[PDB]
Design a protein around this ligand. Sequence first.
Ligand code: CLA
Ligand code: CLA
Ligand code: CLA
Ligand code: CLA
Ligand code: CLA
Ligand code: LUT
Ligand code: SF4
Lengths: 73, 740, 41, 212, 85, 203
Amino acid sequence: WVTFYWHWKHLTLWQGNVAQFDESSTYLMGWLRDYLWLNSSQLINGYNPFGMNSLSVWAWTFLFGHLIYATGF
Amino acid sequence: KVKIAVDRNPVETSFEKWAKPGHFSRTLSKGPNTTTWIWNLHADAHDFDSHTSDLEEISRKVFSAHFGQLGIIFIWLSGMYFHGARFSNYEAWLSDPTHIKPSAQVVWPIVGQEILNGDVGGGFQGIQITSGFFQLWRASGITSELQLYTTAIGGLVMAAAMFFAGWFHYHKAAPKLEWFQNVESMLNHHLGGLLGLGSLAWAGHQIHVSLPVNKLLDAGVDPKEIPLPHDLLLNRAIMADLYPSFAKGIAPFFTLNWSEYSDFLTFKGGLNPVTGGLWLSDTAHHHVAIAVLFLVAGHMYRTNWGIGHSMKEILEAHRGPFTGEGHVGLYEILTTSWHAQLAINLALFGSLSIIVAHHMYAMPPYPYLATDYGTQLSLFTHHTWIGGFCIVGAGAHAAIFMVRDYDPTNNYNNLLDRVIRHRDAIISHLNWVCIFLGFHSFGLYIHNDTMSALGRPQDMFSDTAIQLQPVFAQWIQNTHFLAPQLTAPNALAATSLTWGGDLVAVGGKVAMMPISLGTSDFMVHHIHAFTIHVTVLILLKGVLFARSSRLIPDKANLGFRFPCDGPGRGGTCQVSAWDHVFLGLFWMYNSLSIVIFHFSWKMQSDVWGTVTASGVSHITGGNFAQSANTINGWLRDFLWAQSSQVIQSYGSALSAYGLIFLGAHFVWAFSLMFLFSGRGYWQELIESIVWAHNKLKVAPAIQPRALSITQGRAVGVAHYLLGGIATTWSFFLARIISVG
Amino acid sequence: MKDFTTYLSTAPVIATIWFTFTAGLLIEINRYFPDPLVFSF
Amino acid sequence: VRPVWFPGNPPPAHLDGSLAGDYGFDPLFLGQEPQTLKWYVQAELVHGRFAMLGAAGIILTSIGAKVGLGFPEWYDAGKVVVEKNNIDFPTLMVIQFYLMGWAETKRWYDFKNPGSQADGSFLGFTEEFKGLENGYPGGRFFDPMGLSRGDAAKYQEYKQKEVKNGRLAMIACLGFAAQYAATGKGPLDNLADHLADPNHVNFATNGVSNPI
Amino acid sequence: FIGSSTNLIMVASTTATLAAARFGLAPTVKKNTTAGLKLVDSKNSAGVISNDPAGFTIVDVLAMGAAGHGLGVGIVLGLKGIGAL
Amino acid sequence: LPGDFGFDPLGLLDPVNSGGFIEPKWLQYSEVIHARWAMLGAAGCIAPEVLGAAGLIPDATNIKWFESGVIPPAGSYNGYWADPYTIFFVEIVAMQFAELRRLQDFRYPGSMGQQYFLGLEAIFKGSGDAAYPGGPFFNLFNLGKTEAAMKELKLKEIKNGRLAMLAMLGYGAQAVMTGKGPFQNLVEHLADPVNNNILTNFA
Ligand code: CLA
Ligand code: CLA
Ligand code: CLA
Ligand code: CLA
Ligand code: CLA
Ligand SMILES: CC1=C[C@H](O)CC(C)(C)[C@H]1/C=C/C(C)=C/C=C/C(C)=C/C=C/C=C(C)/C=C/C=C(C)/C=C/C1=C(C)C[C@H](O)CC1(C)C
Ligand code: SF4
């Protein structure tokens, strides 16, 4: 929670619109749509059937984590 | 000598035992002292083997309970027909099926929920239904809301009849045992009466109401001008106008000149091109043939006259060299135990449900069904899930028969005995094949993922790189597409359009187009096979190791449901057959989730979409063959791309889904507390809070106890399934109601 | 009739009746007084 | 034997025939407890008395209405009496609750404690607010002519007549209600309408009663 | 229509089945086929009362009539299916 | 015991382990009630046709039995003194009294001669049996007066009733198939036997 919160507040600070935080930070759909869903656009496009770019290793680690986690269950 | 055997007034009718909770068992009766007793009151309510030890009383109980279940079903159906009659736009839908979406529920104008009333078309406001009663009603011929209201009243009356019947047969005229143990008479009457005469009667209704009314509705006349069906029964000449065979009456039937009924009993194949459903003449012909088949099958067994078979003779005649005595002793098993019957019947019942789902998307039977995408998706998904649950139940009750009602003295050298006697070979090989399918079916996806991320897409399994073609399914597809010319000379078309051929478009949308099978299909099919085999492993292992094992030599004496046998011999958590059912529930969830994801994405990518007279533009553009070999493909193109409608539904008339999404997540994550943790910690915490109440003299005189181990696990899996399935429900409905 | 009243005196029946009462009361208050946020009055 | 509401069935155990109008009619066994039966006795008597008085009102006002006097029919008299004189509606209702609440509360707490109001708490009155039986509060105010303390058997006859006429009046007022809901006209107008054409003006012709 | 072709097939099928059952060939109420197609006696009947040296019932009439009509319908619709009749 | 012909292959007259509405003392009672109503109905379905063909009633009547107003789709008759619903309410009330009191005599034998019913009490005493009450009105004249003749009259009642039941099923089937009256069917079949049958009227 503390790291999600810090990260999103500083993303909205560094981008420019603190208004997006001060409005969408008060209801959980704001978090799910405006932080987890919007910001994972360039991540999962790390590789596709069209090519790949710098953040392909991250886009592979990103699934690696889930795999370990689900094995954890 | 099969006959009626009924006892008189066994149990009187009084409210006396309603004020005495837990009256049924000896243990429960003495009253509560802990909070475990409440959950024990609810846990053993229907365990009809745990009140008494006599067959007759249990049988009477289950008979009347069946009546109760039927009654509640009738109340439900009556509710559906009533809501269709009063709070819907059914007539406005009949006037124009396209562009007017089915709605059958209206909410009250309070705190703001009135935004849920959507603009469904037709001057009406409410919540769109996907249950698809409207297409069913148009298939039956219903044109007015009055007939729906009458059907509602009839349903309610039948419900009261059922509850009275249950009361009568438990309290006033309760049958004896040997009424129940006449399985052969029951087979004859069910096969003939229920299935057969139901088919014959419904064929009658189709031929005399549903064929002509739908012929007029598809002819283009509005539903009010269409004659009422009793005018179709009474006036022969109107039927003679529609189908000239009726002008000859029933003379062709009784003189075996059936070829003159070729106007309303047909064999044409594909679909109704103006409607999108099956031809109703085929449907009537189908039920006629079904009825003849079942009425023939129902005269097979011996009841009172010399003709017919005996079940014991048939069973005892089948025994070979590899199986010793064969089936000798299964008749005594299957007439004296209810859990064995429940196992077999739940098994075949659930599998039947899944077959229902498959045929129901492949060959759409109801008029204007195939172009209502949400209805298609919801019906297939719903029947899939019900099938899965029923099969897991089959596993559970087979285990219960293994624990309780199995007696080895009546069962010596036998199919059941030999299965128990090489359970080790069985489970070992099933384990092997599970691991083999695991490595290959999932490692293909991991390999494609790795290769597609390392810069070389030429070393992954796909349609353009190294190829894996389902040659068998493609060959079968072509076989059936070619069938109407060699191996079915009298049909005019194939039985469905998924086998190949042309395209049927109703109102701009696609009813059904041929489906092709490529490498992604190969891989997902083997995923399905893998998860099915794993679930079979868990459940069958539970059944076979329910009485004893190498670990516990006396697992039978501990019963069906028990938590452990201590931390000894290493630790023996979860050795009951019940916990095998538990883990089976988890894997059933997994397998069926994959199945319905496969269906949803495959349909949105290769079948549905609009016919824009520029080829076909599907909903997602046809990306299944290129993306369904990478886990990143699923996570991006399916979960991340297709969630844009369920997450942005706020403010529209669709926000209930985008609000039940999050709640489903919450319950899913709430299950984990019950799954991960254990009851000793909660017992101690509850003890400290009990101290905090002892300080203020609010000690409850019933004692707070934490849940037992088995209950904690069960509650965990309940919340798990509820949250997961609710999430998938919300996602599917928001997506396909939004863009479909 | 005494045993029927005692059956009505069990826990879940009274929970159902009392929660219906409380729910309906709050619902009626929210109908006749639409959208309350502050008290000021 | 007593005349039963259903010739052949024995009467239930809690109904004996000591009451008035006792025909053994209780299929749901609502009056099995003696206190509950006592309370329902008082309830039936009160409903019957208001019903008799009300149906007399309806019938007399309708008789005056059909003949050309200018009386409104009973579904209109409240509106025209409140509107026409000057009367403010809510103050009349409030005074109704004042007086009815006072007297009705006296009755309630005379049921709970059966002989309590005869103490002298009310202005000065003693033994004129003492009840005689359950629901029969006969004194100088409620039995001024004095029929309850003479000719005891004939008084039992009066009890029987009261209960029978009360029940008839209750279903009569139900008749007025449903009859107006069906036909939308006054009750004695319906009587004259049915009396003009009995074979063709009845409930089986409105189209609202039997929707078949 | 009486005396035509399908009439002969139906009468022939019904007479064949009934005369096969009554003359000790087909399985009747009394005589029962074993697993090896051997005629053995039946047990636990309704205790019929009907005189015929075979021991004939009103049940074999229904049974072998139904079999006769199934067989006859099969043959008639088959021969009309081919084209030869 | 009447009408016992050695029949009943399906076995419903077994007293052993019986109850509910299937027992010897209710199925026999049901047989006699059905027999009596069937006799009455058979004569009623024939009578307008034969009386109208012999010229005794006018031609406003002489209508077929399913066109009386029983089935309003198949044809009704206006000229009754009221609507058929107004007739039906009278039917409900009257048959309610009659059938309901009959039920009370079955459930409690002899309990219909105590409570005041306008003085009609010596008439409704019933007897030991429940399907043959007797009394001064159900047995106006003392028919038979003995035992050797009573069984004969019961037997004749039963056999006539069974014949009537089959006849009434015949009227129903014929009215479905050919759509004409029963006397019309008798006339048509006695005209041309070979050219009018059931199998000629397969249409
Ligand atoms: C033609 C006769 C007939 C028919 C129609 C049925 C039909 C049925 N039997 Mg059944 N049964 C029969 C003969 C018949 N049985 C005989 C001869 C025996 C004794 C060997 C039994 C013993 C038996 C048992 C022990 C049980 C059933 C059950 C059922 C129900 C299965 C639930 C279902 O899917 O129904 C689908 C629902 C419907 C078709 C709705 C239609 C229901 C109406 C009432 C038709 C019923 C016809 C009725 C049986 C005829 C007698 C009616 C009565 C007034 C005399 C179904 C209603 C099970 C059940 O549900 O119990 C309640 C059950 O536990 N039967
Ligand atoms: C199982 C369902 C079923 C039912 C209920 C019906 C019913 C009917 N079909 Mg039918 N039909 C069916 C299946 C069915 N069919 C199938 C599967 C086929 C395809 C082979 C056909 C093909 C077919 C054709 C081709 C025709 C019909 C026709 C008819 C109607 C007249 C039948 C006839 O000529 O007399 C048959 C006679 C009887 C059924 C006897 C009825 C006996 C009555 C009910 C007994 C009542 C007696 C009782 C005592 C009365 C009470 C009296 C008092 C209380 C008032 C009838 C409504 C004909 C029709 O009218 O066309 C519109 C027609 O031309 N059907
Ligand atoms: C994603 C998490 C996850 C994974 C991977 C597994 C994996 C497995 N479970 Mg499982 N399980 C899980 C979650 C998971 N479970 C959860 C949450 C539950 C609770 C309900 C269960 C409950 C459960 C039960 C009850 C059972 C299993 C069984 C199995 C096995 C099936 C055989 C198989 O496919 O192995 C193949 C292995 C894989 C597919 C894993 C991936 C392997 C990769 C692709 C290749 C490996 C090569 C590797 C890279 C080389 C290593 C190099 C390195 C050293 C440098 C397998 C070990 C069943 C079993 O053992 O019987 C067969 C069984 O009975 N599990
Ligand atoms: C969704 C996940 C989730 C949630 C909601 C909780 C919630 C809670 N946990 Mg935690 N927990 C979780 C996951 C979760 N946990 C996991 C995965 C683990 C690892 C095993 C733990 C391990 C854990 C421990 C070890 C402890 C807790 C404790 C607590 C309680 C903390 C007090 C609190 O916040 O009260 C808030 C309570 C709630 C929000 C509960 C929801 C109540 C709902 C809103 C009311 C019902 C609504 C409605 C009436 C339902 C109608 C449905 C009808 C059919 C009944 C609370 C009940 C501690 C505790 O009990 O301290 C007192 C504690 O000791 N948890
Ligand atoms: C569906 C399951 C089912 C089964 C297996 C049974 C089985 C039985 N019931 Mg039962 N019953 C059922 C449902 C069922 N009932 C329902 C739903 C009701 C409420 C209406 C009743 C009410 C009932 C009573 C009141 C009685 C029984 C009795 C009996 C027993 C003897 C029945 C017999 O031989 O009569 C043979 C049946 C008949 C002669 C009647 C056939 C005609 C009726 C109308 C049924 C028609 C059914 C058919 C589907 C209608 C099709 C509609 C079409 C014509 C338009 C037997 C144990 C009797 C008993 O216990 O005595 C031992 C008894 O007294 N049952
Ligand atoms: C014996 C036996 C033995 C074994 O064991 C088993 C079994 C087989 C089951 C059995 C059998 C049975 C049978 C056969 C039965 C039958 C029945 C019937 C038919 C009835 C009718 C029945 C019938 C009936 C009632 C009827 C009645 C009728 C009537 C009233 C009528 C009326 C009328 C008239 C006058 C005329 C007008 O315009 C109309 C009306 C108004 C309508
Ligand atoms: S008590 Fe719990 S941890 Fe211990 S053995 Fe049993 S289940 Fe396992």
